[PDB]
Enzyme design. Structure first.
Site, PDB file in Angstrom:
ATOM      1  N   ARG A  20       4.075 -11.431  40.996  1.00  0.00           N
ATOM      2  CA  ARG A  20       4.503 -10.823  39.737  1.00  0.00           C
ATOM      3  C   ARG A  20       3.409 -10.222  38.874  1.00  0.00           C
ATOM      4  O   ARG A  20       2.222 -10.583  38.955  1.00  0.00           O
ATOM      5  CB  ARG A  20       5.166 -11.837  38.813  1.00  0.00           C
ATOM      6  CG  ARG A  20       6.421 -12.468  39.296  1.00  0.00           C
ATOM      7  CD  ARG A  20       6.885 -13.482  38.261  1.00  0.00           C
ATOM      8  NE  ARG A  20       8.199 -14.005  38.590  1.00  0.00           N
ATOM      9  CZ  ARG A  20       8.882 -14.844  37.821  1.00  0.00           C
ATOM     10  NH1 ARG A  20       8.363 -15.264  36.668  1.00  0.00           N
ATOM     11  NH2 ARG A  20      10.098 -15.253  38.198  1.00  0.00           N
ATOM     12  N   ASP A  54      14.130 -26.627  33.345  1.00  0.00           N
ATOM     13  CA  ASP A  54      14.062 -25.462  32.460  1.00  0.00           C
ATOM     14  C   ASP A  54      13.752 -26.112  31.100  1.00  0.00           C
ATOM     15  O   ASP A  54      13.925 -27.315  30.927  1.00  0.00           O
ATOM     16  CB  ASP A  54      15.385 -24.703  32.393  1.00  0.00           C
ATOM     17  CG  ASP A  54      15.623 -23.840  33.612  1.00  0.00           C
ATOM     18  OD1 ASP A  54      14.944 -22.783  33.733  1.00  0.00           O
ATOM     19  OD2 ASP A  54      16.488 -24.226  34.451  1.00  0.00           O
ATOM     20  N   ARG A  96       3.177 -25.970  44.765  1.00  0.00           N
ATOM     21  CA  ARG A  96       2.713 -24.635  44.876  1.00  0.00           C
ATOM     22  C   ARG A  96       2.058 -24.412  43.526  1.00  0.00           C
ATOM     23  O   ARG A  96       2.602 -24.789  42.468  1.00  0.00           O
ATOM     24  CB  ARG A  96       3.906 -23.732  45.097  1.00  0.00           C
ATOM     25  CG  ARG A  96       4.261 -23.686  46.536  1.00  0.00           C
ATOM     26  CD  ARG A  96       3.684 -22.437  47.047  1.00  0.00           C
ATOM     27  NE  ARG A  96       2.769 -22.610  48.136  1.00  0.00           N
ATOM     28  CZ  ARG A  96       2.049 -21.622  48.645  1.00  0.00           C
ATOM     29  NH1 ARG A  96       2.149 -20.385  48.162  1.00  0.00           N
ATOM     30  NH2 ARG A  96       1.203 -21.895  49.615  1.00  0.00           N
ATOM     31  N   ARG A 110      19.292 -20.869  42.089  1.00  0.00           N
ATOM     32  CA  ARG A 110      19.905 -19.592  42.394  1.00  0.00           C
ATOM     33  C   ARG A 110      20.091 -18.699  41.162  1.00  0.00           C
ATOM     34  O   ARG A 110      20.396 -19.189  40.070  1.00  0.00           O
ATOM     35  CB  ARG A 110      21.257 -19.819  43.052  1.00  0.00           C
ATOM     36  CG  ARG A 110      22.396 -19.813  42.082  1.00  0.00           C
ATOM     37  CD  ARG A 110      23.480 -18.870  42.565  1.00  0.00           C
ATOM     38  NE  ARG A 110      24.355 -19.487  43.561  1.00  0.00           N
ATOM     39  CZ  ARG A 110      25.484 -18.930  43.991  1.00  0.00           C
ATOM     40  NH1 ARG A 110      25.854 -17.740  43.517  1.00  0.00           N
ATOM     41  NH2 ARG A 110      26.258 -19.576  44.856  1.00  0.00           N
ATOM     42  N   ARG A 126      26.723 -10.997  40.570  1.00  0.00           N
ATOM     43  CA  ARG A 126      27.922 -10.592  39.862  1.00  0.00           C
ATOM     44  C   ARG A 126      28.323  -9.154  40.182  1.00  0.00           C
ATOM     45  O   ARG A 126      27.495  -8.347  40.635  1.00  0.00           O
ATOM     46  CB  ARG A 126      27.686 -10.737  38.353  1.00  0.00           C
ATOM     47  CG  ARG A 126      26.467  -9.946  37.829  1.00  0.00           C
ATOM     48  CD  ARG A 126      26.323 -10.035  36.308  1.00  0.00           C
ATOM     49  NE  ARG A 126      25.862 -11.346  35.826  1.00  0.00           N
ATOM     50  CZ  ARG A 126      24.648 -11.571  35.305  1.00  0.00           C
ATOM     51  NH1 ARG A 126      23.773 -10.579  35.208  1.00  0.00           N
ATOM     52  NH2 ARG A 126      24.304 -12.790  34.860  1.00  0.00           N
ATOM     53  N   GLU A 157       0.193 -12.462  38.914  1.00  0.00           N
ATOM     54  CA  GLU A 157       0.448 -13.834  39.323  1.00  0.00           C
ATOM     55  C   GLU A 157       0.369 -13.979  40.843  1.00  0.00           C
ATOM     56  O   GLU A 157       1.109 -13.303  41.576  1.00  0.00           O
ATOM     57  CB  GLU A 157       1.831 -14.244  38.806  1.00  0.00           C
ATOM     58  CG  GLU A 157       2.259 -15.658  39.142  1.00  0.00           C
ATOM     59  CD  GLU A 157       3.665 -15.980  38.634  1.00  0.00           C
ATOM     60  OE1 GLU A 157       3.917 -15.850  37.403  1.00  0.00           O
ATOM     61  OE2 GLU A 157       4.516 -16.359  39.477  1.00  0.00           O
ATOM     62  N   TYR A 185      11.625 -29.484  38.898  1.00  0.00           N
ATOM     63  CA  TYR A 185      11.523 -28.275  38.120  1.00  0.00           C
ATOM     64  C   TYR A 185      12.594 -28.348  37.036  1.00  0.00           C
ATOM     65  O   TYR A 185      13.781 -28.385  37.332  1.00  0.00           O
ATOM     66  CB  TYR A 185      11.750 -27.046  38.986  1.00  0.00           C
ATOM     67  CG  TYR A 185      11.680 -25.787  38.160  1.00  0.00           C
ATOM     68  CD1 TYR A 185      10.533 -24.992  38.162  1.00  0.00           C
ATOM     69  CD2 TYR A 185      12.732 -25.433  37.303  1.00  0.00           C
ATOM     70  CE1 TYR A 185      10.430 -23.874  37.336  1.00  0.00           C
ATOM     71  CE2 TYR A 185      12.635 -24.330  36.470  1.00  0.00           C
ATOM     72  CZ  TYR A 185      11.485 -23.552  36.490  1.00  0.00           C
ATOM     73  OH  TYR A 185      11.379 -22.457  35.649  1.00  0.00           O
TER      74      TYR A 185
HETATM   75  C1  FAD Z   1       5.530 -20.459  36.250  1.00  0.00           C
HETATM   76  C2  FAD Z   1       6.597 -21.182  35.430  1.00  0.00           C
HETATM   77  C3  FAD Z   1       7.510 -20.447  34.676  1.00  0.00           C
HETATM   78  C4  FAD Z   1       8.533 -21.088  33.893  1.00  0.00           C
HETATM   79  N1  FAD Z   1       9.420 -20.280  33.209  1.00  0.00           N
HETATM   80  C5  FAD Z   1      10.412 -20.859  32.479  1.00  0.00           C
HETATM   81  C6  FAD Z   1      11.423 -20.033  31.822  1.00  0.00           C
HETATM   82  O1  FAD Z   1      11.440 -18.818  31.875  1.00  0.00           O
HETATM   83  N2  FAD Z   1      12.407 -20.695  31.096  1.00  0.00           N
HETATM   84  C7  FAD Z   1      12.427 -22.119  30.992  1.00  0.00           C
HETATM   85  O2  FAD Z   1      13.304 -22.592  30.327  1.00  0.00           O
HETATM   86  N3  FAD Z   1      11.552 -22.868  31.625  1.00  0.00           N
HETATM   87  C8  FAD Z   1      10.549 -22.310  32.376  1.00  0.00           C
HETATM   88  N4  FAD Z   1       9.666 -23.099  33.049  1.00  0.00           N
HETATM   89  C9  FAD Z   1       9.764 -24.574  32.953  1.00  0.00           C
HETATM   90  C10 FAD Z   1       8.841 -25.157  31.777  1.00  0.00           C
HETATM   91  O3  FAD Z   1       7.459 -24.755  32.011  1.00  0.00           O
HETATM   92  C11 FAD Z   1       9.017 -26.689  31.811  1.00  0.00           C
HETATM   93  O4  FAD Z   1      10.404 -26.959  31.528  1.00  0.00           O
HETATM   94  C12 FAD Z   1       8.156 -27.439  30.768  1.00  0.00           C
HETATM   95  O5  FAD Z   1       6.782 -27.210  31.028  1.00  0.00           O
HETATM   96  C13 FAD Z   1       8.458 -28.894  30.912  1.00  0.00           C
HETATM   97  O6  FAD Z   1       7.657 -29.750  29.884  1.00  0.00           O
HETATM   98  P1  FAD Z   1       6.871 -30.970  30.342  1.00  0.00           P
HETATM   99  O7  FAD Z   1       6.276 -31.608  29.096  1.00  0.00           O
HETATM  100  O8  FAD Z   1       7.653 -31.746  31.189  1.00  0.00           O
HETATM  101  O9  FAD Z   1       5.740 -30.557  31.187  1.00  0.00           O
HETATM  102  P2  FAD Z   1       4.340 -29.663  30.964  1.00  0.00           P
HETATM  103  O10 FAD Z   1       4.522 -28.573  29.995  1.00  0.00           O
HETATM  104  O11 FAD Z   1       3.722 -29.348  32.128  1.00  0.00           O
HETATM  105  O12 FAD Z   1       3.369 -30.503  30.139  1.00  0.00           O
HETATM  106  C14 FAD Z   1       2.765 -31.779  30.546  1.00  0.00           C
HETATM  107  C15 FAD Z   1       1.443 -31.931  29.700  1.00  0.00           C
HETATM  108  O13 FAD Z   1       0.803 -33.227  30.109  1.00  0.00           O
HETATM  109  C16 FAD Z   1      -0.629 -33.002  30.126  1.00  0.00           C
HETATM  110  N5  FAD Z   1      -1.161 -34.045  30.996  1.00  0.00           N
HETATM  111  C17 FAD Z   1      -0.904 -34.243  32.347  1.00  0.00           C
HETATM  112  N6  FAD Z   1      -1.569 -35.289  32.863  1.00  0.00           N
HETATM  113  C18 FAD Z   1      -2.291 -35.794  31.809  1.00  0.00           C
HETATM  114  C19 FAD Z   1      -3.232 -36.934  31.712  1.00  0.00           C
HETATM  115  N7  FAD Z   1      -3.546 -37.703  32.720  1.00  0.00           N
HETATM  116  N8  FAD Z   1      -3.778 -37.141  30.463  1.00  0.00           N
HETATM  117  C20 FAD Z   1      -3.467 -36.345  29.376  1.00  0.00           C
HETATM  118  N9  FAD Z   1      -2.615 -35.275  29.367  1.00  0.00           N
HETATM  119  C21 FAD Z   1      -2.055 -35.034  30.605  1.00  0.00           C
HETATM  120  C22 FAD Z   1      -0.797 -31.619  30.649  1.00  0.00           C
HETATM  121  O14 FAD Z   1      -2.102 -31.121  30.398  1.00  0.00           O
HETATM  122  C23 FAD Z   1       0.342 -30.823  29.916  1.00  0.00           C
HETATM  123  O15 FAD Z   1      -0.027 -30.186  28.709  1.00  0.00           O
HETATM  124  C24 FAD Z   1       8.600 -22.518  33.878  1.00  0.00           C
HETATM  125  C25 FAD Z   1       7.685 -23.283  34.656  1.00  0.00           C
HETATM  126  C26 FAD Z   1       6.688 -22.653  35.431  1.00  0.00           C
HETATM  127  C27 FAD Z   1       5.751 -23.536  36.230  1.00  0.00           C
END
Ligand code: FAD
Ligand code: FAD
Lengths: 367, 367
Positions: free
Chosen positions: A278, A348, A247, A170, A174, A298, A346
């Site tokens: 967007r 942040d 999605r 959410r 405010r 987007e 999801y």
């Molecule tokens: C559209 C969108 C907008 C967002 N906006 C914000 C924002 O404004 N503020 C915010 O704080 N957060 C935001 N987020 C959240 C943020 O993107 C995530 O918190 C962050 O990506 C989490 O890190 P992660 O390492 O878990 O995952 P990810 O960044 O997804 O990274 C996982 C990595 O693992 C790799 N990988 C996967 N499978 C394999 C495999 N088999 N072999 C080798 N490599 C592999 C992938 O290629 C990738 O590089 C957003 C997310 C999305 C989807």
């Protein structure tokens, strides 16, 4: 023989690597993409740092976490104030006095609150069980129709009355004039981009690009004592019980030979009849003077194998699916499952960084 | 025998004391009021910190200066986004896309710019003969008529066409949707107020209240090797050449038994027919839960030598006067003149802190 092989160079993996390398642990990072950073990856276009997989704004209330990233790269004071375009109307997000003033002409806080409370009258007061009911219980009918419904229906490609009440984090509601999208004490964008930040984290670490861990699971897993896995949890087990629903998104980017396209970093289109959800004008995230500008449209779509998973559909069906993979994972000897993908959630950025720090501390308490 | 006697416990004086006490110098602070902090003084009213002599928002681009105040008291991330009410219309300040959208319905940056560039040329390249022409050539008549004219006329004493163009040298205009009044990298309010911050700077320092240095100059002067004077420079020399001119303000403050009056810290009234220029709702500067709210109306006040000096006129006539007093001050040794009052200039808080830090370093490098 590595102590740790980290799958994925996103924030989760990059943070684990940054901490483990200081504890004198031998580490290898394996990334299937041709670049590091995961979903936060940024790419420079003649001076403009482009948010390749969606706008990413950093925000937290945790001073230790804000200092942790700022100690690597300086952040600016960017404040996220998305706009909402509905037909021929422009509104300020999140839901605040500017929004109410635009919608009804009201200037008085109490007045605005009476209005919202009065639109919730037709609906009664039952416990919200879906997104439409939850949204209306917070902002009323007019705001929901104009700014939530079409948007939500496009991004989830499903009806609002069918989605869970809390399928989307959410945003603020405010009664002060304040377009600040986040209520956090700290908020900004890394000057130079996120890729640079993740580069600092991976500095002095063995990193191999272009390698899909799942295509050589057993062999790669035998090269380390422990595995930290940040990829899709269901794919790790060959979709054995079926795939988790998401999605995805598609980004259409284009360069323009003028300096300012829409005058804002993020603008949402809440009309169900406009294809994209967007438009992102990357230069507004961090002040720069260029004669050109790069704009991204987007578009949401249902995720299939092969697409990048972005928004997990957190309903009962899928949550039961996830629990089954979680049981399998709970049995995986040398693997630590962490990150948005590995946890079907999801996160942040501050939350994921925080999850990674706890996990490396938990690993060191006793190996 | 003190090394330094500091006259005035405002920011300039309080900073010199904070630094000098760090260098093992014996220091005495003399303040004519019954409280410290000068013009930045805040007072608590059942939990709401009241900005007694005008709204005060801290801002700077100097990280060292931002960390300096932050190590003493933590600041929140308040963003000054003033509003203006002209008749039945409400507008967002400073001049930005939100303003233009409100004024003309325009959403495109280039379109907004065309409208303004054209209106700036109502009278061609003609050099502005008065304040009204000056303003019109900066932003056009629509913005000037609705948001500048009446406001400026109330704060000065009448007609814009009867005022010098010099008064307004520039009116900031941006073509992005951004209500942030300051472009600085750092901005916020001290949690707990400015008085708390200044108390920290004066911690461990001898402070005497209710004493006007000038009514006992010799006796007080013999108590130290050096004097740092932050009071009115002209008054220091008995208005020998006449008094420096200032614009003054008066404040009427009311407590209300409801939590939110106008939903914003600062709202300007640009209609010449409304007596006050601003209404300040103090609690919005820093989040607090109180059932009440304190609201202050700000009215331009005719100034006479004896009234509180708020804003210096700074026209050629007064600058001239100032140079004469400056010559005298240059003959006065062991006396350092610093601060808004001692230098007949308007200073932002970070500028005055900066000036005091360098002044002390200059004091040390030269003795
Ligand atoms: C559209 C969108 C907008 C967002 N906006 C914000 C924002 O404004 N503020 C915010 O704080 N957060 C935001 N987020 C959240 C943020 O993107 C995530 O918190 C962050 O990506 C989490 O890190 P992660 O390492 O878990 O995952 P990810 O960044 O997804 O990274 C996982 C990595 O693992 C790799 N990988 C996967 N499978 C394999 C495999 N088999 N072999 C080798 N490599 C592999 C992938 O290629 C990738 O590089 C957003 C997310 C999305 C989807
Ligand atoms: C209406 C208004 C709004 C402002 N808003 C902002 C803002 O939003 N952001 C910002 O950065 N800055 C703001 N400022 C500027 C800020 O007020 C000044 O930067 C600050 O007051 C400067 O400190 P100073 O010590 O020079 O002077 P002052 O604070 O005026 O203090 C001088 C002190 O000396 C005392 N004194 C004077 N003469 C004598 C004497 N003979 N004997 C003993 N004691 C004496 C006085 O009583 C006083 O306490 C504002 C100023 C005004 C007038």
């Amino acid at each position: 023989m590595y102590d740790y092989i980290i799958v994925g160079s996103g924030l989760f993996g990059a943070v684990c690597a940054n901490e483990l390398k200081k504890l004198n642990k031998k580490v290898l990072v394996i990334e299937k993409r041709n670049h590091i950073g995961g979903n936060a990856y940024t790419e420079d276009c003649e001076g403009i740092q482009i948010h390749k997989y969606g706008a990413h704004i950093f925000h937290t209330n945790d001073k230790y976490i804000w200092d942790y990233v700022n100690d690597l790269v300086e952040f600016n004071r960017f404040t996220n104030s998305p706009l909402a375009i509905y037909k021929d109307k422009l509104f300020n997000l999140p839901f605040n006095m500017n929004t109410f003033h635009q919608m009804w002409g009201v200037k008085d806080p109490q007045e605005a609150q009476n209005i919202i409370n009065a639109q919730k009258k037709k609906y009664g007061d039952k416990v919200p069980e879906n997104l439409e009911e939850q949204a209306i219980s917070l902002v009323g009918e007019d705001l929901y129709q104009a700014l939530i419904k079409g948007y939500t229906e496009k991004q989830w490609g499903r009806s609002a009355k069918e989605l869970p009440a809390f399928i989307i984090k959410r945003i603020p509601v405010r009664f002060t004039f304040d377009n600040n999208y986040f209520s956090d004490r700290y908020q900004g964008i890394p000057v130079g981009g996120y890729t640079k930040l993740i580069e600092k984290m991976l500095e002095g670490v063995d990193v191999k690009l272009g390698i899909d861990f799942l295509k050589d699971k057993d062999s790669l897993a035998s090269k380390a004592h422990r595995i930290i896995y940040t990829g899709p949890i269901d794919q790790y087990f060959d979709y054995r019980f079926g795939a988790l629903e998401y999605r995805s998104l598609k980004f259409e980017t284009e360069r323009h030979e003028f300096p300012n396209f829409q005058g804002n970093a993020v603008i949402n289109f809440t009309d169900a009849n406009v294809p994209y959800t967007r438009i992102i004008e990357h230069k507004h995230f961090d002040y720069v003077e260029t004669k050109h500008t790069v704009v991204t449209k987007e578009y949401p779509l249902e995720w299939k194998v092969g697409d990048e998973p972005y928004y997990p559909v957190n309903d009962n069906k899928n949550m039961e699916l996830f629990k089954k993979y979680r049981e399998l994972a709970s049995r995986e000897d040398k693997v630590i499952f962490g990150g948005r993908l590995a946890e079907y959630k999801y996160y942040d950025m501050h939350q994921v960084i925080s999850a990674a720090l706890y996990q490396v501390k938990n690993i060191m308490s006793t190996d």
